[PDB]
Amino acid sequence: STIEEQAKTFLDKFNHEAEDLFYQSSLASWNYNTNITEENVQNMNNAGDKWSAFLKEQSTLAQMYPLQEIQNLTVKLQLQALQQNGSSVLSEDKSKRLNTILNTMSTIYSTGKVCNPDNPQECLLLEPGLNEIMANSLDYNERLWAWESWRSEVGKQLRPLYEEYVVLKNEMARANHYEDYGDYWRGDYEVNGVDGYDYSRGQLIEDVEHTFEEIKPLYEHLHAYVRAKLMNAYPSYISPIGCLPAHLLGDMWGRFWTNLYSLTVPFGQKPNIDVTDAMVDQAWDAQRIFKEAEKFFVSVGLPNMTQGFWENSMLTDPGNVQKAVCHPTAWDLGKGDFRILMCTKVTMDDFLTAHHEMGHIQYDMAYAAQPFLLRNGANEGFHEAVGEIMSLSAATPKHLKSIGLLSPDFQEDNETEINFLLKQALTIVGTLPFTYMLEKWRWMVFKGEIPKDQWMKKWWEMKREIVGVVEPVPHDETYCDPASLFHVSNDYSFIRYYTRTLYQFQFQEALCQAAKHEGPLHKCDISNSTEAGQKLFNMLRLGKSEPWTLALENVVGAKNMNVRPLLNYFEPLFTWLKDQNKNSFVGWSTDWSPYAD
């Protein structure tokens, strides 16, 4: 009789109808990365627009539902989700211009052609040799060209193409009654209809900046450590008072610090811990890595999954006779079928990601009784952040004594844990102001703050402010530096990587308290504890059906992001970085430039 009884009948029609069409096109899409064929690539044209036709025909009926008289919380979120129309709010010729520009952004990233005019006999790409050359470039001019030519010829033709991209995406938000395209990523995070737990639209500028000051000494002891250990490699290049060039960070951008480590190691006499040479003498295969990982979930209290996982899914690559994309993306096919396609060897980081990839699937079982648009994480970034917290407990030396990958007699002194806490802070802790830097570039260009000549003027001025990096080559207004990144042109959310640290180390404090661990947080293990397993089990069965600001108080008892459990993880490393950094110069200088001669 009411609007609430009319809203449940439309969405329960929408529930089982979307279970059929999502599983039908993802069965060929699981065969897409399995087999590269001529037959299945025209099935991507056949079944790929079946998702595109279904979402706009259900947005043809449902935009006339008001959100004002809806009493229940669940329906509102589900309906906002149904209503936001995306790219269909334009006219005819403006939408088809937007459809053909995204096909040109994806093909220019991988197939992009740049090599050397001094000797153009043989050229390189972004996936092959490139990796090998970068890996080893103790030189100076050999690594200087590989960063500059990757920026210059790729972003030459994309920079007039991004002049049309900034004006067209401002028409996305104003038809959706928002302000800019930079706040389209944070439109998922809003919670309305609750008393006192409500989330405003100016809070994410406020909450991140208050946590930025407390992590400002956290990066600064890591900033002086990279300058101190590179003094023997480069005498004349890195200044002690000045800043760092960008291309010495061991990556095409500097998002990953995991390569430069082959230099920044504290102790070369004490070796790094590796399970790779240990598992090859005991005759293990790729199946037994997930047999030992399956017994990790039954000791924490999580139930056993379905019996059809092992027989219909593949792991080892079946020869060179067919082409497979082995890239580790987690697959949710819908209707109880959860598969995986990985690239497997016997290595120490394949065992590290095995509790990450099974962390996705064991979360994916529990929300299967929920309706389909509420099948997600707690926010949009919980789906890839769920696996690394139990992957950190599997990388502990205490857990490996029980499952027997290490020796039964192992001596761990105070200099053994310096190598473990530095390597885990490379791709997690040390990228947090680098995640913050281009996102504040992302929100302020869409509000109309800067003109055309101030576009790259704001770029290197902020880079010597937040992370303290001055670029060695001065740039023109014909070059675009962010354009070479994977998360820019392919339209992905880069906002998940800032909260990757702040969700997991906050949740590590609540789970190790209920498991009763006495010591530092890097020696904690969640196994053989049934007390913290039922605390985890109330979190895994929700999704975004429960709002994310009400799901934090069920676990940690706090309504916000706190810095203090990450500093407790940093606390044995905080004493060791204080003793080393006394001879060096703290902070960095603004006026130092490499190209001033």
Binding site: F10, H16, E19, D20, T306, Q307, G308, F309, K335, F338
Partner: protein
């Protein structure tokens, strides 16, 4: 105003919760008629004398 009957989607590759399971139950009741269908519980060997 919506059509009440909703379709099934059948595929062997789902797994344990989404497979179909055919369920028939037996209903027993008492009425004025005497009891009709009774039970075999195996029989012993016939002996003499």
């Amino acid at each position: 105003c919506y059509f009440p009957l909703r379709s099934y989607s059948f595929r062997p590759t789902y797994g344990v919760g989404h497979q179909p399971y055919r369920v028939v139950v037996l209903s027993f009741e008492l009425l004025h008629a005497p009891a009709t269908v009774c039970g075999p519980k195996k029989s012993t060997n016939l002996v003499k004398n």
